């Protein structure tokens, strides 16, 4: 079993000792060697076990029963500091000192789409065709970046252009081509990459790369499970709240209730005052987790886009189609439909156009071959010119 | 909606105007700088009542710059639209994205998404209009609309109207 | 006349009101959240956004304009950013006052250890100056070493 093995009062104690950084495993090996050497002698090292954890830097934990045993184990070592920096580990901490880590995900799944940390395809989305059993590397499906004779743009490996620019192409199978030492399978590069070269979480996909990857599958973006999970992650993480926001509750006993955010504490507890026909209920403040709150957007409110192609665009709400909200823009003066997850009720725009485009305000520019004008107002997407 | 409000203005006068006609000059300066202006807080100031008998008080000399500062209090007629208000209008332009009406000095834009569906935009009609079987709204046509949202600018106000509810549309 | 024209009216300070900054106000007046310890992005100019040298905080270079106000170096006053703390910590300047406040109130019900029923307590509350008022209230409530769940009738204490 696993539950029954939890420690008791009569179990051997655990001590932690500060040591010099980077020598923890060395101290562990020295302790084991000393225990083995003195095992079977008149004065054996009266300890039971010793270990360390990578996260808990500078600490080595020994399971024993006596402080003299700890002193004897540490006697004759140079990594131990001058002072006896030893402490008694609390019995409750015994389970935590040996609990595992990095259990967020079971494994890297073959066929999943991931981003590359570094290399020539730094940041390019890649499909995990193969996961090596070692777990340190994995073979991936990528879009080649070649010039055929500062990196070239990603493009499917073209055998005809490659032969024209380099007639030394190799062939090993049908559809599997090796050019310049790189193996391209049906126009897609297949190359092993280390685990330290990949981002397996918070992956941001683009429909352009998705289409370029799924075109060979005879269907545009047939696989959408991992994409749906990424959508859920993006929707959940992008939500940020402020006092005074009108929100609705999705779960809990208070489901389908409206309220206004009164105060914000940390990023997971939000104090909300609820609104209802009963006056005595409207005078109560409730702290509610943010994971069960949805923003309420009323028609005719100034709202600013948080994230997306229309970032920093503002307008007035016109149509509320549930998840997707429609609003008339201020700069383009046209209706734009964006999800309610990307909107914040900002009563004032005050948009700054700096660090965008080539021209600033009051710039005398040439409209065309005949018309010359000056800039009166700048936008995130266009400019206004008086000729 | 029109209102009467007691407003105040801070007026700075250059020393070159320190003459016997100081008071009247301040009066015309106030009239030129207030009549017709548009402030988001108040709306539009259309006229100033008793414009020739406004008290200006005693101006204070700004230390280090010589110019005198005057505090002028006056009563003026002010118009400001409110959210959720139904007012009369006259259509000024017809466009596929919607039609623009005028409510006094304010110009209101109504999008197609706030127009009843039966009022299909007819570009072939002369002039082009948003028309139904029994309704035809074109340039110069009286319309009764409800203001839904107001946008505040530096010295301008942008309002959005709707005719999608009852007792609205053509009148 | 050495300053570029601004349409805001020019006035002079008549009162300075002191006080503390609420976390809500700190979050409100901030323009960016500081989270990355690296000062420089990749040591290739353009300091990392979200770091301690975010361009939104303000500009100190002649050829670089502030990304928040758009003004030059001579006009940008600087804009604040905020950093969220994982665990709340003491303000080093208020620890003695925090200790005094802890001595004045109950640690469970969050109420004063004395009430207006005591003539001395009412006399102390009658004073106007906040500092002397706090001093008198502390001098009285310091001796009271136990919360009362009942009137010395329930006074709101937890006992």
């Amino acid at each position: 079993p696993q539950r029954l093995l939890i420690p008791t009062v009569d179990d051997p104690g655990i001590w932690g000792v500060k040591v010099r950084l980077g020598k923890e495993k060395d101290v562990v090996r020295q302790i084991l060697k000393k225990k083995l050497a003195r095992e079977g002698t008149k004065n054996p090292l009266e300890i039971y076990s010793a270990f360390q954890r990578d996260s808990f830097k500078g600490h080595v934990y020994i399971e024993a029963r006596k402080a003299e045993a700890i002193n004897d184990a540490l006697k004759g070592n140079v990594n131990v500091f001058s002072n006896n920096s030893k402490f008694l580990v609390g019995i409750v901490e015994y389970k935590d000192l040996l609990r595992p880590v990095k259990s967020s995900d079971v494994k890297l799944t073959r066929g999943s789409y991931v981003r590359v940390k570094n290399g020539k395809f730094k940041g390019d989305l890649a499909q995990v065709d193969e996961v090596l059993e070692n777990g340190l590397e994995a073979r991936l499906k990528l879009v080649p970046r070649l010039d055929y004779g500062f990196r070239p743009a990603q493009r499917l490996f073209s055998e005809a252009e490659a032969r024209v620019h380099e007639p030394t192409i190799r062939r090993d199978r049908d559809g599997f081509v090796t050019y310049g030492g790189e193996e391209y399978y049906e126009g897609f590069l297949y190359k092993t990459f280390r685990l330290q070269n990949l981002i397996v979480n918070s992956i941001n996909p683009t429909l352009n790369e998705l289409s370029l990857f799924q075109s060979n599958e005879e269907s545009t973006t047939i696989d959408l499970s991992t994409i749906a999970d990424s959508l859920k992650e993006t929707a959940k993480n992008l939500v940020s709240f402020q006092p005074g926001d009108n929100v609705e509750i999705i779960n809990g006993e208070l489901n389908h209730l409206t309220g206004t955010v009164s105060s914000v504490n940390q990023s997971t507890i939000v104090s909300v005052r609820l609104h209802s026909d009963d006056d005595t209920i409207n005078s109560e403040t409730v702290e509610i987790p943010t994971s069960d709150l949805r923003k309420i957007f009323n028609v005719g409110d100034h709202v600013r886009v948080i994230h997306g192609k229309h970032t920093d665009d503002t307008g007035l709400i016109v149509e509320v189609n549930g998840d997707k909200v429609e609003f008339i823009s201020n700069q383009t003066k046209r209706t734009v439909i964006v999800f309610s997850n990307y909107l914040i009720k900002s009563t004032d725009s005050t948009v700054s156009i700096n660090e965008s485009g080539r021209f600033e305000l009051h710039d005398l520019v040439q409209v065309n071959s005949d018309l010359v004008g000056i800039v009166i107002r700048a936008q995130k997407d266009s400019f206004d010119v008086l000729c | 909606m029109f209102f009467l409000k007691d407003l105040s203005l801070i007026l700075t006068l250059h020393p070159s105007y320190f003459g016997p006609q100081m008071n009247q000059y301040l009066r015309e300066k106030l009239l030129t700088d207030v009549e017709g202006t548009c402030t988001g807080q108040f709306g539009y100031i259309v006229t100033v009542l008793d414009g020739m008998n406004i008290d200006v008080g005693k101006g204070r000399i700004i230390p280090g710059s010589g110019s005198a500062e005057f505090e002028v209090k006056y009563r003026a007629v002010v118009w400001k639209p409110f959210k959720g208000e139904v007012v009369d209008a006259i259509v000024s332009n017809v466009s596929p994205i919607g039609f623009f009406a005028d409510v006094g000095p304010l110009n209101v834009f109504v999008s197609t998404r706030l127009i009843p569906d039966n009022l299909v935009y007819n570009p072939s009609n002369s002039p082009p209009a948003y028309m139904s079987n029994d309704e035809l709204i074109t340039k110069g046509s009286k319309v009764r609309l409800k203001v839904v949202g107001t946008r505040t600018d530096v010295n301008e106000i942008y309002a959005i109207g709707s005719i999608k509810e009852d007792f609205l549309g053509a009148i | 006349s050495q300053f570029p024209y601004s349409s805001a009216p020019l006035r002079s300070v008549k009162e300075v009101q002191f006080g503390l900054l609420s976390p809500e106000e700190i979050r409100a007046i901030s323009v960016v959240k500081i989270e990355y310890p690296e000062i420089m992005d990749e040591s290739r100019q353009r300091p990392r956004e979200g770091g301690l040298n975010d361009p939104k905080l303000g500009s100190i270079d002649r050829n670089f304009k502030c990304q928040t106000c758009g003004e030059g170096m001579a006009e940008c006053p600087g804009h604040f950013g905020h950093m969220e703390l994982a665990k709340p910590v003491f303000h080093i300047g208020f620890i003695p006052k925090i200790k005094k406040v802890c001595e004045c109130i109950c640690m469970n019900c969050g109420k004063l250890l004395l009430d207006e029923t005591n003539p001395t307590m009412a006399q102390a509350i009658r004073i106007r100056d906040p500092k002397k008022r706090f001093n008198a209230v502390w001098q009285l409530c310091k001796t009271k070493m136990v919360c009362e769940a009942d009137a010395p009738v329930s006074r709101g204490g937890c006992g």
Binding site: H362, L364, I376, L386 | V154, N155 | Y5, S7
Partner: peptide, 27 residues
């Protein structure tokens, strides 16, 4: 012959208005 005059009194187009150089006099 075009000059781009800006005035703080004028509100239209943030005070920017185009006027020919032949129709103005030096102040």
């Amino acid at each position: 012959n075009f000059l781009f005059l800006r005035s703080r009194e004028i509100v239209e187009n943030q005070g920017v208005f185009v006027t020919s150089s032949n129709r103005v006099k030096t102040i």
